[PDB]
């Protein structure tokens, strides 16, 4: 679609897990359940404003779930916990 440089899907939300973080662990899997309830409110947010760009939840466990679902972009070194937008909301100056 337009207003997006890549191919996306509004059916659900993609999940990004850092390379150095093992998916399937108890910490990750528990976080991977209760964040599935964000899919409906991801859709509900986008219905009033169809001009809405990426909505992302950066968990303290390391995984980042964003909407709409779209494939991730050499090795991967992205960690959501080190991003500037995550850091300013984690603490104060």
């Amino acid at each position: 679609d337009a207003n997006f440089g890549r191919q996306i899907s509004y059916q659900h939300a993609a999940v990004h897990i850092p390379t150095d973080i093992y998916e399937g662990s108890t910490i990750v899997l528990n976080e991977l359940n209760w964040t599935s309830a964000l899919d409906e409110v991801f859709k509900k947010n986008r219905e009033e404003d169809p001009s809405l760009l990426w909505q992302v939840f950066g968990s303290a466990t390391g995984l980042a779930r964003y909407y709409p679902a779209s494939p991730w972009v050499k090795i991967d070194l992205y960690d959501v916990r080190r991003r500037p937008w995550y850091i300013q909301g984690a603490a104060s100056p």
Binding site: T19, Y22, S25, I75
Partner: protein
């Protein structure tokens, strides 16, 4: 004829090697395991992939899988202990 000369010593040395193998089994039973990356201690944390830096350079990373490996010469049981102690007695690889 020569071979029978050490009919006694060759027995006491085998007995002592067996006793030391049993002591080593008691001392280092299963303690020689380690993970592929030197950052995970438990076997539960040694699962999945990890980022490895070649030659200690932070600018050249490679993706490798971490495996909870065991030492080639371990002390898990009596036979392995005897093999490890024999290799030690040959004076090869004993510092490692």
């Amino acid at each position: 004829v020569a071979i029978r000369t050490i009919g006694n010593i060759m027995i006491v040395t085998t007995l002592l090697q067996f006793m030391f193998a049993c002591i080593g089994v008691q001392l280092f039973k299963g303690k020689f395991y380690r993970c592929t990356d030197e950052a995970k201690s438990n076997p539960e944390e040694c699962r999945g992939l990890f980022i490895l830096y070649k030659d200690g350079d932070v600018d050249s990373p490679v993706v490798r899988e971490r495996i909870w490996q065991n030492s080639d010469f371990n002390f898990d049981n009596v036979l392995s202990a005897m093999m490890a102690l024999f290799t030690v007695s040959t004076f090869e690889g004993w510092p490692a």
